[PDB]
Design a protein around this ligand. Structure first.
Ligand SMILES: CC(C)CCC[C@@H](C)CCC[C@@H](C)CCC[C@@H](C)CCOC[C@@H](CO)OCC[C@H](C)CCC[C@H](C)CCC[C@H](C)CCCC(C)C
Ligand SMILES: CC1=C(/C=C/C(C)=C/C=C/C(C)=C/C=O)C(C)(C)CCC1
Ligand SMILES: CCCCCCCCCCCCCCCCCCCC
Ligand SMILES: CCCCCCCCCCCCCCCCCCCC
Ligand SMILES: CCCCCCCCCCCCCCCCCCCC
Ligand SMILES: CCCCCCCCCCCCCCCCCCCC
Ligand SMILES: CCCCCCCCCCCCCCCCCCCC
Ligand SMILES: CCCCCCCCCCCCCCCCCCCC
Ligand SMILES: CCCCCCCCCCCCCCCCCCCC
Ligand SMILES: CCCCCCCCCCCCCCCCCCCC
Ligand SMILES: CCCCCCCCCCCCCCCCCCCC
Ligand SMILES: CCCCCCCCCCCCCCCCCCCC
Ligand SMILES: CCCCCCCCCCCCCCCCCCCC
Ligand SMILES: CCCCCCCCCCCCCCCCCCCC
Ligand SMILES: CCCCCCCCO[C@@H]1O[C@H](CO)[C@@H](O)[C@H](O)[C@H]1O
Length: 219
């Protein structure tokens, strides 16, 4: 229990550091720019709360012979569409296309959560639904959204592509962790699972936010 608790506290601290840095960076509150900072504060702030809750030993749900971390999935349901929103803003995406990518994202996270909570082998059908919706989300990120980003200045398009790449490459690792970890075949221990996810969560949220902060200043 000590290892898992320690990892969750590390996640909480890293998320808190991001949250404070984004809130501070955003204080200037430029009318067009404010939205981006508030969104980053929401992304890392919600994650911080989730990690604190888990560190305190809340929401460790036993499912068959594994443990499900409910706050992790609730976190993702809330924070991943905020990341997609940030990317859609950057890309200058149209309202229909925003709706589509937010829908596909929500399918991924709901299917992953539901799958984690189903004891039997039918849970892999839920994983599959999420994997299919994720391929759709990736298509949008690398296709239509990238085309949309090209209507922006070269610097904004470069930022879009940088954050798009970070997002696509790291998000693609999560389903493999689900499959190899406790929700799937339970090869990886809960500690190894949590350690990998803490890194990935930190980089996809904080380590995404700092890249945007850097580009925003350099712009
Ligand atoms: C906008 C809405 C339409 C979307 C709402 C999200 C919704 C879709 C989530 C669906 C799942 C929902 C049905 C939950 C059911 C889970 C339940 C079956 C699990 C069993 O319950 C286990 C409990 C305690 O043991 O864990 C319980 C887990 C914890 C109690 C919850 C974990 C906390 C969250 C991860 C953090 C939430 C964010 C903060 C409330 C806001 C922080 C703001 C920030 C800026 C400081
Ligand atoms: C595709 C796929 C998944 C993707 C999860 C992802 C992409 C999580 C990203 C989390 C972030 C960025 C937190 C911040 C699941 C739900 C593991 C299982 C269903 C298949
Ligand atoms: C990571 C710093 C935030 C810690 C907040 C702790 C609040 C928990 C309230 C006590 C209940 C146990
Ligand atoms: C960024 C400032 C917030 C303080 C960090 C909170 C981490 C506290 C870890 C406490 C673990 C001991 C169990 C209680
Ligand atoms: C300006 C730099 C600020 C960076 C934001 C993150 C703050 C550091 C918080 C500690 C992070 C813990 C490291 C966990 C890594 C993933 C699990 C590794 C276990 C081997
Ligand atoms: C950040 C809010 C943390 C509250 C978690 C609830 C603590 C209950 C511990 C049992
Ligand atoms: C600052 C917002 C804190 C939200 C607390 C949610 C914790 C619920 C777990 C009981
Ligand atoms: C021991 C603490 C567990 C309490 C059950 C979860 C409370 C949910 C709070 C919802 C926050 C919005
Ligand atoms: C998924 C989060 C969306 C944030 C709301 C922003 C929409 C404002 C447009 C009016
Ligand atoms: C035991 C439940 C029945 C089998 C579930 C099917 C699992 C499918 C997961 C594969 C991922 C699909 C992605 C489409 C490939 C193109
Ligand atoms: C998108 C590229 C795949 C993500 C990497 C995560 C999976 C790497 C582990 C593959 C080897 C598994 C060996 C099974 C144990 C026998
Ligand atoms: C482009 C592909 C990248 C290579 C990654 C390899 C694929 C990862 C395999 C994940 C699912 C395989 C399930 C078999 C795991 C072994 C079962 C052990 C039981 C505890
Ligand atoms: C354990 C690793 C923690 C990852 C958090 C991400 C902080 C990295 C800072 C990125 C700065 C890029 C500036 C351009
Ligand atoms: C973290 C802030 C990033 C803001 C990107 C600026 C694009 C808005 C154009 C005005
Ligand atoms: C959920 C899985 C979805 C699979 C990804 C295929 C979606 C892309 O499919 C494409 O959509 C375009 C809209 O931008 C259309 O113009 C194209 O005709 C169509 O091929």
């Amino acid at each position: 229990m000590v290892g898992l608790t320690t990892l969750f506290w590390l996640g909480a601290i890293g998320m808190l550091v991001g949250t404070l840095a984004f809130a501070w960076a955003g204080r200037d509150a430029g009318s067009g720019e404010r939205r981006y900072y508030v969104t980053l504060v929401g992304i890392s702030g919600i994650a911080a709360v989730a990690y604190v809750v888990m560190a305190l030993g809340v929401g460790w749900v036993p499912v068959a012979e594994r443990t499900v971390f409910a706050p992790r999935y609730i976190d993702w349901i809330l924070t991943t569409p905020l990341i997609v929103y940030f990317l859609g803003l950057l890309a200058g995406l149209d309202s229909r296309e925003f709706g589509i990518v937010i829908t596909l994202n929500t399918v991924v996270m709901l299917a992953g959560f539901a799958g984690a909570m189903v004891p039997g082998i039918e849970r892999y059908a839920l994983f599959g639904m999420g994997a299919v919706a994720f391929l759709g989300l990736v298509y949008y990120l690398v296709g239509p959204m990238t085309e949309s980003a090209s209507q922006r200045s070269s610097g904004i398009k470069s930022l879009y592509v940088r954050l798009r790449n970070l997002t696509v490459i790291l998000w693609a690792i999560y389903p493999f962790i689900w499959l190899l970890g406790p929700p799937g075949v339970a090869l990886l221990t809960p500690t190894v699972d949590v350690a990998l996810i803490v890194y990935l969560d930190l980089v996809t949220k904080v380590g995404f936010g700092f890249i945007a902060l850097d580009a925003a200043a350099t712009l």
